[PDB]
Amino acid sequence: YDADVIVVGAGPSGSYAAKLLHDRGISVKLVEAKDRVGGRTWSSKTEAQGGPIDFGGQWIGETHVLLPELGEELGLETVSSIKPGNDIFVFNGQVTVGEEDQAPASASWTAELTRSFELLDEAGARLGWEAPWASPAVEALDGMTVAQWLDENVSSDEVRMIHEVMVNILNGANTTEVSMAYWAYFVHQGEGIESLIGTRSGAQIAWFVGGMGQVTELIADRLGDNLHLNWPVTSIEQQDSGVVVSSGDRRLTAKYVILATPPSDASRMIFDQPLPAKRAQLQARAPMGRLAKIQVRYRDAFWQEENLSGAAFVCGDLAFWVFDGSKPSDSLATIVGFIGGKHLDLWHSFTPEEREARFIDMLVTNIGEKARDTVYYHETDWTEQPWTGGAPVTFMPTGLLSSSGSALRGSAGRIYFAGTEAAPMWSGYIEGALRAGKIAATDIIARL
Amino acid sequence: YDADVIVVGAGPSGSYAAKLLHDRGISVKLVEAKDRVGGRTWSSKTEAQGGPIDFGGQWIGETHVLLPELGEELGLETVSSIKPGNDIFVFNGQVTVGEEDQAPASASWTAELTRSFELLDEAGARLGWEAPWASPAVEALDGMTVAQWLDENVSSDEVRMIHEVMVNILNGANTTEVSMAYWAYFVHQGEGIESLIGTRSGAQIAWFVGGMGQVTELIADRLGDNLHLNWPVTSIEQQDSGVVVSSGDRRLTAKYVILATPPSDASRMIFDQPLPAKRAQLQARAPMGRLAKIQVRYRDAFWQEENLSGAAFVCGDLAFWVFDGSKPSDSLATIVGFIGGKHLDLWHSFTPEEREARFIDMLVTNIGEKARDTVYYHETDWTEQPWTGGAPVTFMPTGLLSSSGSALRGSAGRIYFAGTEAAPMWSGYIEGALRAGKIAATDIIARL
């Protein structure tokens, strides 16, 4: 054998699984398709004026345990993402100012928003994170779309617009595309909707100074020539005695394989023998969402003069989730905008010059005319990255979670499923990637 | 350049495009991932006792033009598939005998079945075959499943069960999985439901003696070393003056490429530069169905003694579409059964021996105790074939046809989309594969 274990994919999940194996002195190879590690995490200390920038995922949550622990182990510093001032809600170009991070008690829609979150959380609780595919509630929820559930359960146009931007960003998909069962499950296993839409709480509370890309890069440094970049896995062969992992004519042999890729990217690989039917259907039918991350930098955080946090739920035909991404040690202030799903479909119909003009028009509504005085502007389109299907997460259409969801976790013979989609909680997030890597590495260390 | 054109995929569509280019004197290479040509067509003259057998698609339709013309050009003989006698309808093990190929006027559900076919045909005509993604009716139908359409349009259990077997076989997918827009479009562009479910009419009227695999095999012979087998395309690079098609380290260069694969199988390839957004989303999100084709042979066609055609709609938890697949030149009689979608998910939970036992028990209901005296039994599971996503066809979940469906046809720069899914009519069928290949080859001939 070339190694005891081959890990396929050097995102946070595969990188962490390889780190845990290498730390125990188990022989491991980490193979990665791209010319870099990080997967959906990606940062540069030098490419953007004003300081490090994260092109992919960057927020650390308040309940995350493995991510801050690994940050400490790799010698990274965290900084708070929390901003003072009022968040805003924008509906078709019209601004409602929040009260800190709360919808204003005076708005007609605030009471129904709270009710709509309890309904969504209740649907999630009926499925659970442990075995949603086996829930007596899953058949009915998995035969309908989020759009259909919203038609049945939400009256207020404002409440419906907030739910639409949340799904189009948090799943990168239209409410007409995503199973309500998958959405309800996804939100519950992220500790509920208020957790995932936190602007200063829940999933969004901190950053690593120097960028999130450092997590995988500092692991790659520990692994040395056990990491192979530019090594796209084309086929995986299971034998009685081990596994053969191929990239074209290049072959590596091992006792076990950890597949640390999204199900949709695993579908590109040829398996002999064929994977279990539920897993093969999961890989073919659970696509990635679509998201773009747009970042603008300014000489200073001028919105703080108006007691604006910079955080905004921008709803309508071109919907965004907007944050202040500034670190105290940066040289410039940063606004980060996300656009996904059906809103990104419209964005894709525009020229690059039209997109930048529309983005800056949107910011002028949120933070005023100083938003035109940009020092830097950048878009990362996560539908155009090779061997990454999309962003931020995998989603499922009707019928899949209830028929095939159990194949998100565990193993098939000598192939162990990692990647964030395999995590029992925090699937979709870096914390889930680490949890899924830890489970696969832990189970293989017991088999060795 | 290695050739003017590289054609990717040696199913009927690619094979036919390569043939048309070669016949016009245009230099062409045909590259195929598998160790054989044919794709979803696949036959053997010698592997099965009693005569040639088709593991993949085999029926020729009464309106098909290119397919009978090509068979004639390649020197193949056609024979009628039409069988005399009564078809049957089976509901959870209870037989209703038809009147030839008709539901009996005396059955409580026959009038409702005819009404339901008119409602389905009327939904498809609102979308049309030319540009269903542009129909005013498409967004509403594309946001709901076939199962939800059935809940609104169909009352009787028997009628609902017939529609469920039709979708699970003709799209290889559950009614809760398939967009009603997609299904309605698919059926319309196949000349309507009665055309696609014909047992002795419409899409099912003839066969090629010797097997449908002979079409691609005889084209392969004509192409000689212009065909490369075991040549899975891993990347396609578009340049100013041509394209580079790669299989690992192996490279071919041409002026133009014909992609003659299903969208889902095209998603495996890495494109530099990235395809148009609609096309990239289509390839990622239009999966293939799941189908198995089960064939049993007997000393004679004993069901004819009971004035049974051998054709049956077997409905319920384990649903099949059954035919007499006997040719006069065969030395045994053949029964052919299809199982797909959610019925095939249940079948997959059984062992190979449980499946054979259950299939023979099912045939005993349809044609009596002599069905136990098998001479030959074979299953082709079209979810276990490398570089074919499934069978019989590509399907779409909610949201896709209305957002991205236009990307089924045409071209992106020097890359021309073929494969049956690109056909303006008879998409899903061999006739469609030939039509799409003809359109791609004709447009490239004009460009050169």
Ligand SMILES: Cc1cc2nc3c(=O)[nH]c(=O)nc-3n(C[C@H](O)[C@H](O)[C@H](O)COP(=O)(O)OP(=O)(O)OC[C@H]3O[C@@H](n4cnc5c(N)ncnc54)[C@H](O)[C@@H]3O)c2cc1C
């Ligand atoms: C714009 C954006 C914003 C996000 N925001 C956050 C956030 O703030 N906080 C958070 O926690 N999460 C966030 N996420 C999600 C987070 O990035 C992912 O959950 C996490 O990266 C998943 O890690 P992973 O290792 O499971 O998969 P990935 O990061 O997707 O890594 C998979 C790896 O597998 C490789 N691979 C694929 N196919 C092959 C093959 N055939 N051979 C070999 N290698 C292959 C890929 O190239 C890739 O490197 C965000 C994502 C994006 C893109």
Ligand SMILES: Cc1cc2nc3c(=O)[nH]c(=O)nc-3n(C[C@H](O)[C@H](O)[C@H](O)COP(=O)(O)OP(=O)(O)OC[C@H]3O[C@@H](n4cnc5c(N)ncnc54)[C@H](O)[C@@H]3O)c2cc1C
């Ligand atoms: C069980 C079954 C029953 C059917 N019944 C009928 C019927 O009776 N009549 C009928 O008209 N239709 C029928 N069909 C459908 C019919 O078989 C298909 O419509 C037809 O074969 C489509 O032809 P195609 O060339 O578009 O695609 P395919 O036949 O799918 O061929 C695509 C080819 O591309 C190759 N390929 C994929 N990826 C790559 C890559 N990366 N590099 C290189 N090559 C690649 C594949 O290996 C394959 O050979 C049936 C299908 C099945 C499976």
